[PDB]
Ligand SMILES: Nc1ncnc2c1ncn2[C@@H]1O[C@H](COP(=O)(O)OP(=O)(O)NP(=O)(O)O)[C@@H](O)[C@H]1O
């Protein structure tokens with residue numbers, strides 16, 4: 001209801017695929033349902049929820065489909081593939097969230113918004129690509145649908161958006177047009193959440209704590225931790241540029257900007273980390 | 286713009302494709318641009334708008350790729366293809382819409398919602414496919430996201446949804462799951478329009494008017510017609526079940542339920558029909 005604080009939640013790969021699980025519909029559905037049970041608890045606890053996710057495996061599969069049917073069907077550019085993946089992913093999360101609602105005798109009240117994320121065309125990353133092949137991962141500037149998203153949470157709708165970090169776009173002399181690229185879903189969710197001026201940013205992943213000296217002897221799992229300690233641990237290089245790196249960067253940005261707690265944890269214990277009982281919680285300088 | 290009347294607008298195939306055009310992204314993009322101009326005028330005129338469309342060619346192209354690559358990537362079902370066509374199409378309309386707002390120096394305020402539509406899973410169509418090769422077309426019973434759509438127009442947001450008629454679904458024992466149909470985009474929009482209790486239902490196509498004796502020596506283009514008169518015209522069988530039939534069905538039902546007017550016109554004379562100056566306009570007795 002209306003009284004509730006807002007928490008912005010970024011699901012990871014494990015909301016749809018477990019390690020070595022294959023990309024079929026029913027397998028992914030089962031994962032989302034499970035994933036939706038954890039989320040419902042957060043909404044039941046009285047929190048206002050905005051859901052986000054990644055789309056890597058899903059958009060890759062679509063792009064896999066568009067390339068291998070090229071002779072029988074026109075081949076869509078990456079950014080459009082991104083788009084079909086939002087309908088796909090959105091659909092699933094929409095459906096599952098409604099089903100967990102009804103299961104609890106609460107009338108369904110959530111939706112999925114196609115989302116476009118503007119990026120700077122003059123981004124360095126256009127000129128030094130990454131993961132497949134070869135493709136930019138530019139910083140998110142703006143969530144184009146931000147305004148409607150705020151309207152929806154101001155009305156206590158459970159909003160699902162930015163799945164995959166948003167459809168990458170640019171605006172040049174008043175024209176938005178899609179670009180061929182990908183955006184880190186976590187940076188994108190930091191972006192939304194600070195604009196929303198949210199009360200929390202949660203990044204949900206498969207590990208229950210960020211660590212330093214990760215997979216190593218003197219390993220240490222981060223718990224509740226101050227902004228300055230994590231800023232220092234980051235330049236120390238503890239976080240991997242392809243996994244944990246963006247997340248911490250995501251959490252650090254949002255906490256720096258709003259003073260509000262950001263959280264990294266297992267999808268399986270989301271509510272506990274909110275209640276203070278575990279997970280890496282970055283708090284305020 | 287909290288003062289404007291509401292018009293539910295159902296776009297047709299030509300929002301994205303002209304006679305014998307190729308299902309590629311740029312060919313459909315620029316078609317959508319053209320529709321977006323027409324729509325903007327309506328919005329500029331002061332009306333609240335809900336935007337709908339069909340998806341046949343697009344879901345078809347998607348359903349096509351999923352089989353052409355069923356040996357590289359896993360093959361998705363019909364309703365998930367639907368959810369993919371929705372992301373993609375909604376993407377195009379979203380971006381085009383936003384671009385035309387910017388071109389008029391007006392701040393963007395538009396959204397595409399992923400949409401589900403409940404149907405009875407033992408509808409007669411699951412016993413005799415019969416929609417254009419002939420396929421099913423079950424009767425739409427519920428737009429799941431109705432509540433959020435309602436909310437979104439109450440806030441004067443320009444809402445795009447039920448693209449392609451909505452992802453076909455059904456709800457057994459508190460569980461919504463996807464069926465493998467396609468819904469008539471016009472019936473579905475009639476449902477929404479009358480649930481929203483809109484001031485207008487408008488179905489935009491590639492002909493200026495519904496006719497009787499179509500393409501036949503004594504062809505009468507219908508203009509402004511009371512509901513009783515068009516009921517009796519329909520029963521006689523002037524409206525081919527492939528094309529105009531369900532459009533008139535949709536108009537009739539909407540007007541029978543609300544007493545407000547429905548419309549069938551060409552996409553580019555939409556504002557004129559609203560100004561009473563043309564097009565088939567069905568009204569109450
Ligand atoms: N310093 C670290 N602490 C904890 N885990 C780490 C660290 N560095 C790398 N990792 C790994 O990062 C993994 C989680 O990130 P990741 O593989 O990207 O999953 P995800 O982000 O939830 N999915 P997705 O959003 O689809 O990319 C963990 O399983 C760890 O294996």
Ligand SMILES: Nc1ncnc2c1ncn2[C@@H]1O[C@H](COP(=O)(O)OP(=O)(O)NP(=O)(O)O)[C@@H](O)[C@H]1O
Pocket residue numbers: 296297298299338339340341470489490491492494495496497498499523524525527528529530
């Ligand atoms: N009695 C009739 N009067 C006028 N047009 C008719 C009639 N009967 C059939 N038609 C045709 O129906 C066509 C419109 O419907 P249709 O061909 O299905 O396109 P659409 O419904 O606008 N697209 P979509 O949203 O993808 O289903 C017109 O172009 C007419 O050629």
